[PDB]
Amino acid sequence: AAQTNAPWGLARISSTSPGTSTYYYDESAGQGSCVYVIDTGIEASHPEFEGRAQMVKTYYYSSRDGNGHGTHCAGTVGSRTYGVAKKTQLFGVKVLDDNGSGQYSTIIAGMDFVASDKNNRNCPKGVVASLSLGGGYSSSVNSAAARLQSSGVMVAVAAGNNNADARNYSPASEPSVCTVGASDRYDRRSSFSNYGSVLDIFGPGTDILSTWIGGSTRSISGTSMATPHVAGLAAYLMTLGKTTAASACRYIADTANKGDLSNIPFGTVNLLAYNNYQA
Ligand SMILES: [Ca+2]
């Protein structure tokens, strides 16, 4: 399949080269997988999700996204126009308030919840978690992400936006998960991206067009935005029979575009997510 005039980040993940604007992919497009978007919430009634999205849990008075950030991440995972895996099921877990803030104890409970709830959903091709959140180092937070990954979910987490070594942020710094940094459309590491030994992969995260609340759209940047490109890719690749939740991260890193990013600090992987799709 080919989607012409795609967002730059979708085109980038099916290209050997920067500078093209058509997203190629296998039509199965994540059918039978499911992605949990653990964040501010998802506006499931936004036309771009076509009934494939639903809130499953909140820790606040409402399940509604009053922020936008979770709907945007959800859109890159699996909105019809702005998403990677356009036939996935999305589920939404509101662990963050409408100002984008959350306590670590609620963040940990949301991870626990997802580890169990995957047994109440029909996700034959597997389950991915997308975590566009974090903060200063916490072993309990890392331990929860580790538990979530061990249970059989493919965990993708944002490296953080401090232009710093990610070893001092959680769950960024947990070696068992897939830690994702961001690039721009010129194949440079994004200026704010974290880095270091613990990063697995880069994805597009500068000037990322996606769904927003109010049935709207906007273009925003962050390691928050890079993360759901890898999640949808993992959803996509699991539906294709190419890998499993335990192996997904490793398979993405091994089949990535190599050595094409500039602005890479010594000791950081120069690897960019790529679907390997040959029409
Ligand atoms: Ca890993």
From Swiss-Prot:
Disulphide bonds in the chain:
34-123, 178-249
Query: One Gene Ontology cellular component annotation?
Result: extracellular region
Q: Which GO terms describe its biological process?
A: proteolysis
Q: Where are the transmembrane segments?
A: none
Binding positions for Ca(2+) 1 per the UniProt entry: 175, 177, 200
Reaction(s) this enzyme catalyzes, per UniProt: Hydrolysis of keratin, and of other proteins with subtilisin-like specificity. Hydrolyzes peptide amides
What residues bind Ca(2+) 2, as annotated? 16, 260
Q: Which UniProt keywords apply?
A: Calcium, Disulfide bond, Hydrolase, Metal-binding, Protease, Serine protease, Signal, Zymogen
- Answer whether the UniProt record assigns the keyword Repressor to this protein: no
Task: Kindly state what the record says about how the cofactor is bound.
Answer: Binds 2 calcium ions per subunit.
Q: Which residue positions are annotated as catalytic?
A: 39, 69, 224
Required co-factor(s) are: Ca(2+)
User: Per its record, how is this protein called by name?
Assistant: Proteinase K
Origin organism of this chain?
A: Parengyodontium album
Name of encoding gene = PROK
Measured against the full-length protein, the chain present covers: 106 to 384 of 384
